[PDB]
Design a protein around this ligand. Sequence first.
Ligand SMILES: *C[C@@H](NC(=O)C(=C)NC(=O)c1csc(-c2cccnc2)n1)C(=O)OC
Lengths: 166, 167
Amino acid sequence: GNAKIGHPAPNFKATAVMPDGQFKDISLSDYKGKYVVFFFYPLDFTFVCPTEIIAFSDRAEEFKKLNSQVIGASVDSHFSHLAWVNTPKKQGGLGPMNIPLVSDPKRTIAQDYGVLKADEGISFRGLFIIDDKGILRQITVNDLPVGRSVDETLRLVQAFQFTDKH
Amino acid sequence: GNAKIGHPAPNFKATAVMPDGQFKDISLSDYKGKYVVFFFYPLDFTFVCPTEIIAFSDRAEEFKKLNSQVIGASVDSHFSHLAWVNTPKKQGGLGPMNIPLVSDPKRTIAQDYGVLKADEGISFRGLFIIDDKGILRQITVNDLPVGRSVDETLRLVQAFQFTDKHG
Ligand SMILES: *C[C@@H](NC(=O)C(=C)NC(=O)c1csc(-c2cccnc2)n1)C(=O)OC
């Protein structure tokens, strides 16, 4: 893709399901002034590590204290995202989210981030840390079966912010 | 570069400084049959998170229990690697190593792994997890100032091994 450490992170404009439960078209450039953790997950309604999304959401406060924004994304439609959020966790849904979920139905954001699994038209489990100036600082890509750690992501964000203070 | 999840990891043949302190030419394909953690660090004698190298070395036993091999690499010469190893830790050295350190002086391995900082001729802090069949499972790339966690790396290796055995 076009994701390079130390270069501007690839911009995107996309329909997201926002924390209030409404659709909104958002761009990554809207979040300039804040650290962004931008992560991909393969499919809505997946039985494979859906709880990572819930964990990022549940621990949003810890990212807020770091003046950082968390954004999830998959190739599913904004309507799929909404359905999943409107499904209670007791029934296997996400429930209400503290983070926006981006829809990448053209697969072009995944392609720009270099995380498209082309033979399936879904994203790998990519995660990217972008600084407050929009510069890409960290690339994480897991094969489909293994999820991400919120603790590791918080460590990375802190460490980048600490080293920025120098 | 050519590192793609679900595809054979780019092979390399390179001079390493081995744990016994001797040079040896090794290939990544030598390690088929084991999980490999292959990581890059920018420069020998760096003041920026050199301790991660020592941590991977000190905790080699935990990687052994996972039947996994850890290999470090930088663009510096094998001679530089050994000098750093032979520098006492209290003087800013690595001390004795339980892992091989690969030399990538042509910058071709860094380039193959997509972690060459072209404007500088050093590698970013890349880390790669390759399975026992040689297939790349995980890509990690940090900008220069931020190091890697051994605990996170162990989590990933074991998790990939567990999910290999059972969906
Ligand atoms: C969805 C969830 N899946 C797994 O964690 C999985 C298959 N994990 C493991 O096999 C595993 C081995 S050791 C380990 C661990 C995690 C956290 C703390 N200590 C050990 N997990 C996932 O990956 O979401 C994070």
